[PDB]
Amino acid sequence: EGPLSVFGDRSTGETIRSQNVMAAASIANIVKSSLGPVGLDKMLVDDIGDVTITNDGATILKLLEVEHPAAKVLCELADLQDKEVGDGTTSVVIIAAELLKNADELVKQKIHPTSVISGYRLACKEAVRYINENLIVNTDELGRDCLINAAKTSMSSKIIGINGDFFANMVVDAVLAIKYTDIRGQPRYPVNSVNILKAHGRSQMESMLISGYALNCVVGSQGMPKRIVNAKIACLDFSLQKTKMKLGVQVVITDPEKLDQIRQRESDITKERIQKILATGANVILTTGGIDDMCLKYFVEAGAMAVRRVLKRDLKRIAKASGATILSTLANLEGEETFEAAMLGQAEEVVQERICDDELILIKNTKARTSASIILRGANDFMCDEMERSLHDALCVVKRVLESKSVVPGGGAVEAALSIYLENYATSMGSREQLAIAEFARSLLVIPNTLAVNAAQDSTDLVAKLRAFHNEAQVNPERKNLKWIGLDLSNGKPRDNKQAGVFEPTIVKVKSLKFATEAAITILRIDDLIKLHPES
Template structure:
């Protein structure tokens, strides 16, 4: 009976090999990323005999590098394939593939199976033409000019909201901000034009005495007065907010039924349980001030109209099974950073360069991501290499 098959080499499996492959791909991307674009820098490469090559072409750089890691070699071959197929975009395709692998590694660490990530990448690549324009429009929507006159693109300000019930092709770009929330009461308006937004980081609920406070009451009527005063304090807070003209109230905390009644009577829209992250973005875009309390340093509670944000429209819409709050057409400063018409400027770039880059980078990332086992065989010894005529002489096969 024969024994089990033996593999004479070093074997690496599981998460370890996946991390090694992604690190190798990231290292290759870090080498060429500074040469990307019109302001990219050149690389000087010197081979073993002293020949000097200065270039910023990704395919040439990777061709001259002595790469040993197998995953890194995949990206080198990827750049060579892009160069043969299109002739341009060799640096971009390597950087895109490395970023896809980095994002896949984060998803795998969150216990998402690699095959699920691969399916998502293939689906995204299939719909890349649809989403590419949407991504560009989303980034341009958050563009602003800093104090030095430089355009900035805060990508983290783009909110990606998921809703069940429709396909990816039915995704939409909102000219504003979307919240996965609903109004606090059905009696509130679902659409407000020329909205004035109050951003609050506290709950609007009936005021109660804090823990540890003891009140000794000898007259039962005094107890009713205390309860009435608690209700009056809450009512005064809401009246101060509404008196400034606020008609949209966003709060990270809760809103009890008594407070909702006052907002319904005033015809205002109140939204509770807004995420702190969303509230900060809305306040920044609309010019509102986030308040954690109405009390000033003297302990007096005030609310001024300068603390409100402005928006052209706030509307609640039902998308699939959920209802969303959409804050549309928030104004941004694009005076010193407007996008130009590249056709009029004479700047052209073939579509096939981007299409091929996305497809090749996705397939390369999928190829590396599917690997969960690496076997590196030991080199053969000199005794194992002896063969042919020499083996025949030693065995006596030529004596016949």
């Protein structure tokens, strides 16, 4: 087509810029309705009837089938925000789309994209500095109440929002349970060590926080006891099965008398291993490998539990919590085959608990380390899945608050303060960077606008009042306490969100700003698209 002679389409100039902005706006409008406490969930039918009910932005954008590259950019941005922070996945997408739209509006006015990019970079840096210098609250000033409020804010907009008074306490206890310290004395909170089990049944308030660990497994044989008082847990990473020689070993019989002895040893090896393990007093034996029937019979006769096909990560968590040691093989440094009590973990109880026609192993009060696990109860599987996603969000938020001890007011207070400060500060830098920074500040206002719109309330006057409050706070040194004024969606009025218990980790806002700015810069840098036709 024409003199260029390339087998594919080509869009250049304002056309491709408008297409990219349209794609980003489409992605933003997909998830705009699921922002804030007055947000609503979504159904996602998976083409074969599978239903996913969710409010998380990352899940929605990951489950969707997207084709435009400028929209795949935003979807991957949401996924990155989920991986690196865990919260604010919808906000970052919305902010990036608004930034891109305003940047393209500037570009259409013959403002060079490089100037817009420079202005966006400067605005992002200054916004981060202003947040770190003026809009942070130290958690040590508040205490456990800060963690509870942050968690409750996290459950807002989720299916467990109304039960926040209980779920926040559960989340905080679970996070504090798994706290451990490493070298140099930094406290670390390894989330994803809190096993989360879903089982429909009783109401949401019947969810249990296990002071220990919950295994989604059952005993191998019905003959074993289903409850041990003083558990001596032994963890194995090998199958307890009939011994079979490897590929390099072959059995050739020339004297027929040796066959019986060989076949006897073929199982006597495993019998001896099991006897060695049991002789040390172990009561519970968890292995990632399989177990044949005869080994199960050995454990039955010994009066000991035995769980097979245990997940590797679950076994590692059990070993860490109970003080046990994973043994991929029974072989000491003397060349022998031994098993001493030093590798035995201990727990105050192990129970085969029954949960709605399903049974699971509860390991309670592990010694030498405290662990946690959560069992979620709901109406059906969709409720349980949404509970798990919201609970993961809350755990991530609490982890961020505990690691970095700074929080910021919620409800769009940070966005309004940043907009005011940036539109004031734009008057000093450059001549077109002025417009770029002003558009950055205006784009930051999309969050409170969306919050107000979702509540079926007048967004214009509410945002105007919030902006007036923040402007008065910035221009009057005697009214610096107004920085915390945010949005109260229940009544549609400005409210001091610091005293209202609406907090967010500072890392959420900082990472959202940085990632959204980078994505907007990346998309804005394009001015021509070549789409080669498929070879088929």
